[PDB]
């Protein structure tokens, strides 16, 4: 059966405060692993039809040595998105996150999101992760990851 557990590529995490689609994950390193699925720049492609369980864990962190978080409005979010190489538009499968106040006097701020779902996937369909504040992403392999594993067949 096919599966995937992709941890964040710590050396290729985008910068800025705008929402982006993450385009770099590990696939064969540490806890990162992939089988009978293909990965191309943050797009985990399904090679075999079936019902998969999709999950994602996203950790945001900020230390005071990096400066200060501006605008005061802070909404740390994660969207698990299903794209396709036949239809241009993409669609959210799962959504998670929280508005936060990180304007305190503490030296470190941390927050993690977790999402999980049972979805019907066809070959050719692709799963991708997009986050709100990539500059706040935790590069740790136990912190920021997303994955999938087949449970049943479609028939």
């Amino acid at each position: 059966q096919p599966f995937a557990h992709l941890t964040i590529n710590a050396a290729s995490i985008p910068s800025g405060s705008h929402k982006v689609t993450l385009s770099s994950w590990y696939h064969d390193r540490g806890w990162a692993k992939i089988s009978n699925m293909t990965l191309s720049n943050g797009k985990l492609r399904v090679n075999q039809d079936g019902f998969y369980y999709l999950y994602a864990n996203i950790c945001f962190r900020h230390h005071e040595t990096s400066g200060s978080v501006p605008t005061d409005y802070l909404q740390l979010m994660v969207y698990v998105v299903k794209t396709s190489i036949k239809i241009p538009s993409s669609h959210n499968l799962m959504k998670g996150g929280s508005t936060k106040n990180w304007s305190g006097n503490s030296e470190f701020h941390f927050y993690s999101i977790n999402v999980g779902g049972f979805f019907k996937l066809r070959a050719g369909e692709e799963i991708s992760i997009q986050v709100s504040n990539p500059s706040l992403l935790d590069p740790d392999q136990d912190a920021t990851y997303f994955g999938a594993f087949k449970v049943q067949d479609i028939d």
């Binding site: 390193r29 540490g30 806890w31 962190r61 030296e107 470190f108 941390f110 935790d138 590069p139």
Partner: protein
């Protein structure tokens, strides 16, 4: 058999994998352990039987961490909290160093990844601030200012000089 560098499996005595290599496939009845070298950014520090190598920890600057040494394929990467911060095992983060109250000074030399040690100000020295870096500074010598020592100083305040 031998406890070090060897392990028993399926009756026979097989040899473990040297640091820098992982156990790709364990011993068969017709061959010994097959050991392949650790991949990029991976490592193993002991004589093991692991299926795969461990991935080096990320010295995240966003956690105020910095690498002392990057480590090899046989060595763990070692991180430390940057200047002014010490590692805290409970939160696994770089906590702000403890400030030393007036009357106390930060002991020198300041340690790399450790919290500030506060020592009371000795005779002839004072501290008038809260600081995790500043140590006990000596009283001002009134002669250098072309003045005289009016009132003697304490551990929390400097002496006062008068142009009398």
């Amino acid at each position: 058999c031998t406890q070090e560098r060897h392990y028993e499996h399926l009756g026979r005595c097989c040899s473990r994998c040297e640091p820098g290599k992982y156990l790709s496939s364990k011993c068969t009845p017709t061959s010994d352990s097959v050991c392949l070298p650790c991949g990029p950014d991976e490592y193993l520090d002991t004589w093991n039987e692991e299926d795969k190598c461990l991935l080096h920890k990320v010295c995240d600057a966003g956690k105020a961490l910095v690498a002392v040494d990057p480590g090899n394929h046989t060595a763990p990467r070692r991180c430390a909290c940057t200047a002014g911060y010490h590692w805290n095992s409970d939160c696994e983060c770089c906590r702000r160093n403890t400030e030393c109250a007036p009357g106390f000074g930060a002991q020198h030399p300041l340690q790399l990844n450790k919290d500030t040690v506060c020592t009371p100000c000795l005779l002839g020295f004072f501290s008038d601030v809260f600081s995790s870096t500043d140590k006990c500074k000596p009283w001002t010598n009134c002669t250098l200012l072309g003045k005289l020592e009016a009132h003697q100083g304490t551990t929390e305040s400097d002496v006062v000089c008068s142009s009398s």
